[PDB]
Design a protein around this ligand. Structure first.
Ligand SMILES: NC(=O)[C@H](CCC(=O)O)NC(=O)[C@H](CCC(=O)O)NC(=O)[C@H](Cc1cc(-c2ccccc2)no1)CP(=O)(O)c1ccc(Br)cc1
Ligand SMILES: [Ca+2]
Ligand SMILES: [Ca+2]
Ligand SMILES: [Ca+2]
Ligand SMILES: [Zn+2]
Ligand SMILES: [Zn+2]
Length: 159
């Protein structure tokens, strides 16, 4: 349950870029992460560079202006606010992690799929195979799929 977006057109904006990855790789990871969720819902996501986006994507360090401070390398990798105005929906990634396109460090795509889950109103899964399982663990992103539980979860919220 919990809050949900009351529209099917949702915008996002990348507030800033980790220096860990090149810009196009960050854009790609985020775009593909939204696509994962749009593939199984009526939701559509558009990136904007100018304007008032629903979901702000932010990389930040330690105490960064909200009530969910980061903890340096390891521990919490990211956090996101559920649907709502203002800071609602926004997804924040811990810059003290080393973000990657791959298995080294912390994979941005996989983390973003999880965080966008939260941005859309999903909670955690008890399926060790679900992207909404509470702890990060790398899986081959080339064959990544939502689990049936993730799909049940998001379809119960939208459509
Ligand atoms: N423990 C781990 O496996 C890695 C660290 C590994 C490392 O050292 O690199 N950390 C993690 O997996 C941590 C653990 C957080 C904790 O202490 O409870 N989880 C997190 O960082 C959560 C964020 C996450 C999970 C995943 C994931 C899960 C399954 C498959 C693929 C990716 N991707 O990002 C944090 P959150 O759920 O958004 C969150 C944040 C703040 C609040 Br308040 C509430 C919820
Ligand atoms: Ca917002
Ligand atoms: Ca951390
Ligand atoms: Ca970093
Ligand atoms: Zn934050
Ligand atoms: Zn989570």
């Amino acid at each position: 349950m919990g809050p949900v977006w009351r529209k099917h057109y949702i915008t996002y904006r990348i507030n800033n870029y980790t220096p860990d990855m090149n810009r196009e790789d960050v854009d790609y990871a985020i775009r593909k992460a939204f696509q994962v969720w749009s593939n199984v819902t009526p939701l559509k996501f558009s990136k904007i560079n100018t304007g008032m986006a629903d979901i702000l994507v932010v990389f930040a360090r330690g105490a960064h202006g909200d009530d969910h401070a980061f903890d340096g390398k390891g521990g919490i990798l990211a956090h996101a606010f559920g649907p709502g105005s203002g800071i609602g929906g926004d997804a924040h990634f811990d810059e003290d992690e080393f973000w990657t396109t791959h298995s080294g460090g912390t994979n941005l795509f996989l983390t973003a799929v999880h965080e966008i889950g939260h941005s859309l109103g999903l909670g955690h899964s008890s399926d060790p195979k679900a992207v909404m399982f509470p702890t990060y663990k790398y899986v081959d992103i080339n064959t990544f799929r939502l689990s049936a539980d993730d799909i049940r979860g998001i379809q119960s919220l939208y459509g």
